[PDB]
Scaffold this active site. Structure first.
Site, short mmCIF file in Angstrom:
data_model
loop_
_atom_site.label_atom_id
_atom_site.label_comp_id
_atom_site.label_asym_id
_atom_site.label_seq_id
_atom_site.Cartn_x
_atom_site.Cartn_y
_atom_site.Cartn_z
N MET A 131 -9.67 2.35 0.52
CA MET A 131 -8.75 3.18 1.05
C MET A 131 -8.67 4.82 0.71
O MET A 131 -7.97 5.00 -0.02
CB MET A 131 -7.38 2.51 0.58
CG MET A 131 -7.13 1.32 1.14
SD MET A 131 -5.49 0.64 1.33
CE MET A 131 -5.36 0.47 3.09
N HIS A 140 1.04 -1.08 -0.04
CA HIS A 140 0.08 0.17 0.03
C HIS A 140 1.05 1.31 0.01
O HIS A 140 2.05 1.13 -0.21
CB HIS A 140 -1.03 0.05 1.23
CG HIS A 140 -1.90 -1.09 1.21
ND1 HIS A 140 -3.06 -1.23 0.86
CD2 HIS A 140 -1.75 -2.22 2.16
CE1 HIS A 140 -3.78 -2.43 1.00
NE2 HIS A 140 -2.86 -3.03 1.84
N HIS A 176 -7.68 -0.38 -4.92
CA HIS A 176 -7.71 -0.22 -3.54
C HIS A 176 -8.50 1.16 -2.95
O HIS A 176 -8.77 1.19 -1.94
CB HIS A 176 -6.17 0.29 -3.51
CG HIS A 176 -5.18 -0.72 -3.32
ND1 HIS A 176 -4.32 -1.19 -2.47
CD2 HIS A 176 -5.12 -1.84 -4.34
CE1 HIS A 176 -3.54 -2.14 -2.89
NE2 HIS A 176 -4.06 -2.68 -3.90
N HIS A 223 -5.88 9.19 -0.53
CA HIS A 223 -6.05 7.85 -0.71
C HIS A 223 -4.88 6.99 -0.94
O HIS A 223 -3.77 7.24 -1.48
CB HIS A 223 -7.27 7.87 -1.90
CG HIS A 223 -6.62 8.34 -3.33
ND1 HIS A 223 -5.81 7.71 -4.10
CD2 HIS A 223 -6.98 9.74 -3.80
CE1 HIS A 223 -5.53 8.41 -5.08
NE2 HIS A 223 -6.29 9.83 -4.88
N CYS A 224 -5.22 5.42 -1.28
CA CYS A 224 -3.89 4.68 -1.46
C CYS A 224 -3.98 4.71 -3.10
O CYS A 224 -4.77 4.70 -3.78
CB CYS A 224 -4.37 3.28 -1.02
SG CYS A 224 -3.03 1.99 -1.13
N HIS A 281 -3.94 14.65 -1.56
CA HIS A 281 -4.22 15.55 -2.43
C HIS A 281 -3.79 16.91 -2.20
O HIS A 281 -3.73 18.00 -3.11
CB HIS A 281 -5.62 15.73 -2.85
CG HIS A 281 -6.27 14.54 -3.72
ND1 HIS A 281 -7.30 14.42 -4.46
CD2 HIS A 281 -5.58 13.57 -4.35
CE1 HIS A 281 -7.60 13.56 -5.13
NE2 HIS A 281 -6.35 12.66 -5.18
N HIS A 290 -28.79 13.55 -3.21
CA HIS A 290 -30.02 13.75 -4.02
C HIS A 290 -30.47 13.19 -5.09
O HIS A 290 -30.99 13.75 -6.05
CB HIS A 290 -30.48 15.33 -3.82
CG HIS A 290 -31.79 15.60 -3.84
ND1 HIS A 290 -32.66 15.16 -5.10
CD2 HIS A 290 -32.54 15.83 -2.65
CE1 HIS A 290 -33.97 15.61 -4.24
NE2 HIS A 290 -33.70 16.12 -3.00
#
Ligand code: NO2
Ligand code: CU
Ligand code: CU
Length: 330
Positions: free
Chosen positions: A140, A85, A135, A125-126, A90, A296
């Site tokens: 993840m 992993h 993943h 995230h992974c 971001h 929604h």
């Protein structure tokens, strides 16, 4: 040289613791882681797944721281486981973131460182190479835251614141189934892867858721717261876218894217875221118751788953418302 530281861681848803514103310164821271893967378951038924984551858871844781510162871481892976992993863131610158470095594988570880610167828330995230996605888716990832230183514121410146825261884451897833248807388962892882892837492619887824498962937241677981317161827531896724837313418521313131620186726115318702891334837213518551837361669309938431738851516590017113018436037838 520076210183450183360481831381621890825791787981868811828741955251751881721381512161826112411161013163212181630157430183470184450381842481560780681980991764784981496983398986688971887712748812118820059982278924388962396987897954992856870172620690364990888904988603893863857351862381825271512121711106410137640185861271460281370580991662681881274980071984046980197986895967790997890683882671881427971001925120851172270069390488891518770281992744490359871281890577790781198983066992291982590683470580780384770175620174832161820128612121716111864213886613982580992974990944690885080839694987991445897977993943991430698974898971993840867651866321871272840153714141510124111172713280927251518105547109113107013113310142624112727241218280617381828571965371848631867512896732988517894828797973596967077978034939018958158923778913497937496985055991281882690887086986698962292839288937787843285828578923994734386708784208668508299945488933878515927230944391892881478906438921877771628721018851116990668922967541828571118261018325017043314021717361823151944261857511884441890665891948895718878514848217866321818461328911018732628314836213216031726222841123978505877430870153822171620117411114835222316121118121627213628812837213856215885217895927990858884461864112844241714131627321416160018123018323118471328951518521628821877732886415929604528803378917995725318811158916697937895514858613858741837361628771717251316280018271118522018426015015616002118522018824017136118732128915018637016578
Ligand atoms: O996983 N790239 O943002
Ligand atoms: Cu991974
Ligand atoms: Cu990415």
């Amino acid at each position: 040289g520076l210183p450183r530281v360481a831381v621890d861681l825791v787981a868811p848803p828741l955251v751881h613791p721381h512161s826112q514103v411161a013163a212181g310164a630157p430183k470184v821271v450381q842481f560780r882681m681980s991764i784981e893967e496983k398986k688971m378951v887712a748812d118820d038924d059982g278924t388962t797944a396987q897954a992856m984551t870172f620690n364990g858871s888904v988603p893863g844781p857351t862381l825271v721281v512121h711106e410137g510162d640185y861271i460281e871481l370580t991662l681881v892976n274980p071984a046980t486981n197986s895967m790997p992993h890683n882671v881427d863131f971001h925120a851172a610158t270069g390488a891518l973131g770281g992744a490359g470095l871281t890577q790781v594988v198983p066992g291982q570880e590683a470580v780384l460182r770175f620174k832161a610167d820128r612121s716111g828330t864213f886613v982580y995230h992974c990944a690885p190479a080839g694987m991445v996605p897977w993943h991430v888716v698974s898971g993840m990832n867651g866321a871272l835251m840153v714141l510124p230183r111172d713280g927251l514121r518105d547109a113107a410146g013113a310142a624112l614141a727241y218280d617381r825261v828571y965371t848631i884451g867512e896732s988517d897833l894828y797973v596967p189934k077978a034939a018958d248807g158923n778913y497937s388962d496985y055991p281882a892882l690887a086986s698962a892867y292839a288937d787843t892837v285828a578923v994734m492619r386708t784208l668508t887824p299945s488933h878515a858721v927230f944391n892881g498962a478906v438921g877771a937241l628721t018851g116990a677981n668922a967541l828571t717261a118261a018325v017043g317161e314021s717361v823151l827531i944261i857511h884441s896724q890665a891948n895718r876218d878514s848217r866321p837313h818461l328911i018732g418521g628314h836213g216031d313131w726222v841123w978505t894217t877430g870153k822171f620186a620117n411114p835222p726115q316121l118121n627213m318702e628812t837213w856215f875221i885217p895927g990858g891334s884461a864112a844241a837213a714131l627321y416160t518551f018123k018323q118471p118751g328951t518521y628821a837361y877732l886415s929604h669309n528803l378917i995725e938431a318811m158916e697937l788953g895514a858613a858741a738851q837361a628771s717251v516590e316280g018271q118522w017113d018426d015015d616002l418302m118522t018824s017136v018436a118732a128915p018637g037838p016578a």
